[PDB]
């Protein structure tokens, strides 16, 4: 339903970044990108790239940059704005945020395709995103169903919300039919399944994977894998791209203008080859478990909100065991120190 | 619901073949395998395994052999009729050829079990084919609900409609308690699903292959993976089954009388064994990646319309790009030459 | 909705074992467990782990040794009572029972958590129990909710009921809010699957642990992996929940004290390390695939009612395969011996 049948970058942007400056210097530089370092698509974001504090700054910075540098942008322009399931609050924030950066008066709003929206839950949280689109183009004289939503699946809820797609589009009270791309958002995503590995370094989720690949079949949308945080893992990318392909989920989240040119270049069929036969650069092959003490400090002492709320679960874990086992009080201190249970005690 | 508890070996046969002689040479041959050699299921195959051209051909010849062999064949007979949830010409062929199959004067359809559906979308496709068995039961006066009807999950639509199965199927609205088998078609489903791999072999889907066995398990249905090509590569194919057999998918699509038997032998218990402790022929040791040229090439100088179709993604990629993507028109001919750009920019 | 947030130990002790002796031996020892030895929930289990001719003795002992010693318990105490989706007689079994266990008078139901509830199939199943906890509730002024309901999940029809919880509990017609645990059964549900593995060792059903994980994340409840019977296997263990842990299923059944101890164990933050780097006690170095004469004996001269059932799926294909395949009756004489072939067809 879209003029994208296929997207393989989907890269973000901090929207309002705090050190002096211009702080929609994130946003001129990536606004003028070309070629394989330009992204497919391309998500201004005003959600969790860039701090709460900043939001509002950076709604006006992205109509101030695509105002003045969009009509020139090769690929799709869709800012990401905030949403929560569960927030209320958030909600009306992203909406607001929605109808300003869509006045038309303002020049972004033409070099605009859509909007992604994270954190939604099931298909009648999408329908109060939808509702919004619906409102804002009315309040603008768009065409209805002009701007695309985009998704990030990122919770349990979303997962689901992803099977019965097909017949809650249809219904004629939503636009749903903008629906356009369904982005799995591994970061929040790991949060809400409350997953946790010993480095700390996301799971794989195959079947999530699987799932949005399905989903997005099954109701004409494109599917999209999440972010890929270990950068200078290039290799680890690729391999993680080559897997999704295998899922059908072909285009994945991009942090940098190198990802983008890796990503860009890695669906598209190879140059020549090839034939297989059956049988300080040290940090790439090393990785750090850390212990209790060193996850209470990586807070205490204190990566994104994501980053930090998806790695409180040992913690939220080990409190939770405290105030509920007094018998296991002794051992507990016995094997973290007296020390050490007293402090993680104190985090929520 | 059905005689076959369990079904092991599920064998297709084309049902016309182009090349002079005797058109109905494959299935009067398949007709005759018996013990070990024989299916459990025998599909007569007048979807893919069939030029289109010879489909009403294939329609008389399964008449034809079913009429003079049939009843001697000693497992159960399914012919694979056409079918496709988005087209309503090819659902209206795949009814007519079932009508004249069951013809009873024409003695086929008292050794015919049932009917194998390709195609099919969701569950609101699955009764459109539902209705057609009833009907061609009422007008050839065959008890109703004996026409077993199976269904190739090759869709991500379809591979959501197994979900809900329990409940529909007790709708008195139809007749779906006639579902038999449920059969994954892993090459449709990797063009449906719009997934790549570098050699282009199959995805090996665990997911689709977990869920299609639960499916089975809640609805009273019976699991059967589908088609594994590399027929050479004796030992893959039981390792595969190894592995559907650990998701409770017991039956596999059989490709040839080879297959028949190896897939008819693997889930019955060893003779002897085993104890196992902890720690030319060169073609089933290597494979090939294809160049961009090389896969121009595997349909630009032209392995059924299921290879065919679900080859032609990393095209179908690079053509939307290149549509889309004027400023990266520069770097696609630094990268491929001018003249494959625009050599694969015609194949759609 | 409940007092833990999060669950690791979900252990189980027979209620009545007929050994002479007292039958409730190790209901009392167990109820002696503290610290680190102790589950977070402990499951006096009158289903499985327990002869079905002790059951109503089991009932018995429950109130008689949680009457004596519940008070001082320090985790929560969740009886497994039988039930069976496909058994009326079943299901007013463990009814019966858990409104003898509850009754006010015997002192047993104050330290009562709740129950888990085996065997469950579809939505409208789980909420006959739901009706039973109600009723039961209010024939012994229990407050409406107080019991809380966990499920197996150990059937195919279960583990779709999962998918649309949220909105069916909120249905005012059920109390269905009690729901507290989603605990996976790999036993039973490698059974209603049909799976079978050459070592008879369960499949590892990833997409179960994902499936049953989402749900509870959706629906608020807590996830927990079913038991690992090889008890030795201590490493092995540990793998599956690093594994389970991946997923966000923090919890796993416990068999043994030692099981407890490790599963406390594993998912609280390690005391120290540690730093990774890219590149008779050979029990748990073999395992041992049986013929079919193994397997006919290890029911034939004949471990629960769970790991029976569960290994009785190739000789139920044998079954079908010889009932159906005359032709065949040759080779597979040829195969096993006239002997075995005519031994393994009573068994059913
Ligand atoms: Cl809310
Ligand atoms: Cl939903
Ligand atoms: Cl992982
Ligand atoms: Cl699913
Ligand atoms: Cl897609
Ligand atoms: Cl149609
Ligand atoms: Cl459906
Ligand atoms: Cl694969
Ligand atoms: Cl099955
Ligand atoms: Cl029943
Ligand atoms: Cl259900
Ligand atoms: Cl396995
Ligand atoms: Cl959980
Ligand atoms: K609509
Ligand atoms: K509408
Ligand atoms: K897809
Ligand atoms: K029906
Ligand atoms: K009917
Ligand atoms: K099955
Ligand atoms: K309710
Ligand atoms: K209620
Ligand atoms: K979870
Ligand atoms: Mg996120
Ligand atoms: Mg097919
Ligand atoms: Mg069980």
Redesign the interface.
């Given at each position: 339903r879209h003029?994208?049948?296929?997207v393989?970058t989907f890269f973000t942007s901090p929207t309002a970044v705090e050190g002096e400056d211009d702080s929609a210097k994130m946003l001129r530089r990536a606004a003028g990108l070309?070629?394989?370092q330009?992204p497919?698509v391309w998500v201004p974001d005003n959600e969790d790239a860039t701090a709460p504090s900043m939001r509002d700054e950076g709604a006006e910075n992205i109509v101030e940059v695509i105002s003045e540098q969009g009509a020139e942008f090769?690929?799709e322009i869709h800012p990401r704005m905030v949403w929560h399931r569960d927030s209320p609050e958030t909600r009306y924030q992203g909406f607001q945020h929605m109808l300003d950066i869509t006045d038309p008066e303002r020049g972004a709003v033409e070099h605009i395709h859509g909007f992604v929206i994270p954190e939604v839950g099931?298909i009648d949280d999408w329908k109060k995103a939808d509702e919004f689109f619906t409102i804002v183009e009315h309040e603008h004289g768009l065409d209805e169903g002009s701007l695309a939503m985009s998704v990030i699946i990122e919770?349990?809820?979303a997962?689901?919300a992803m099977?019965?797609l097909?017949?809650e589009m249809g219904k004629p009270t939503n636009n749903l039919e903008r629906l356009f791309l369904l982005v799995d958002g591994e970061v929040d995503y790991?949060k809400?399944?409350?997953?946790?590995?010993?480095?700390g370094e996301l799971?794989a989720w195959?079947?999530?994977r699987?799932?949005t690949?399905?989903?997005?079949?099954?109701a004409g949308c494109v599917a999209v894998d999440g972010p890929y945080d270990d950068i200078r893992d290039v290799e680890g990318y690729r391999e993680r791209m080559?897997d999704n392909?295998?899922?059908?989920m072909?285009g994945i989240w991009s942090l940098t203008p190198g990802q983008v040119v890796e990503a860009?270049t890695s669906?598209?069929?190879?140059?020549?080859?090839?034939?297989?036969?059956?049988?300080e650069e040290?940090l790439?092959?090393?990785?750090?478990?850390?212990?209790?003490d060193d996850?209470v400090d990586s807070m205490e002492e204190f990566w994104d909100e994501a980053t930090y709320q998806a790695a409180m679960t040992?913690?939220?874990?080990?409190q939770?065991?405290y105030e509920?086992?007094?018998?296991?009080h002794?051992?507990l201190e016995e094997?973290?120190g007296a020390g050490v249970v007293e402090r993680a005690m104190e985090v929520g």
């Amino acid at each position: 339903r879209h003029d994208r049948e296929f997207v393989r970058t989907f890269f973000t942007s901090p929207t309002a970044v705090e050190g002096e400056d211009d702080s929609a210097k994130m946003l001129r530089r990536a606004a003028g990108l070309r070629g394989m370092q330009a992204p497919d698509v391309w998500v201004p974001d005003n959600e969790d790239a860039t701090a709460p504090s900043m939001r509002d700054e950076g709604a006006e910075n992205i109509v101030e940059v695509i105002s003045e540098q969009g009509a020139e942008f090769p690929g799709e322009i869709h800012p990401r704005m905030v949403w929560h399931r569960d927030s209320p609050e958030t909600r009306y924030q992203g909406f607001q945020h929605m109808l300003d950066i869509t006045d038309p008066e303002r020049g972004a709003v033409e070099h605009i395709h859509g909007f992604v929206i994270p954190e939604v839950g099931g298909i009648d949280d999408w329908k109060k995103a939808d509702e919004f689109f619906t409102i804002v183009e009315h309040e603008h004289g768009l065409d209805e169903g002009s701007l695309a939503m985009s998704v990030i699946i990122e919770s349990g809820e979303a997962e689901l919300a992803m099977g019965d797609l097909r017949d809650e589009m249809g219904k004629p009270t939503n636009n749903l039919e903008r629906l356009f791309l369904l982005v799995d958002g591994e970061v929040d995503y790991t949060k809400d399944m409350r997953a946790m590995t010993p480095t700390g370094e996301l799971p794989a989720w195959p079947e999530l994977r699987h799932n949005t690949s399905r989903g997005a079949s099954a109701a004409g949308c494109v599917a999209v894998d999440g972010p890929y945080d270990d950068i200078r893992d290039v290799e680890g990318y690729r391999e993680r791209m080559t897997d999704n392909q295998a899922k059908g989920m072909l285009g994945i989240w991009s942090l940098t203008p190198g990802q983008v040119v890796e990503a860009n270049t890695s669906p598209l069929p190879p140059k020549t080859g090839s034939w297989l036969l059956d049988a300080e650069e040290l940090l790439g092959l090393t990785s750090y478990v850390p212990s209790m003490d060193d996850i209470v400090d990586s807070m205490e002492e204190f990566w994104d909100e994501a980053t930090y709320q998806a790695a409180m679960t040992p913690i939220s874990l080990f409190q939770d065991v405290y105030e509920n086992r007094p018998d296991q009080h002794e051992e507990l201190e016995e094997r973290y120190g007296a020390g050490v249970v007293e402090r993680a005690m104190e985090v929520g």
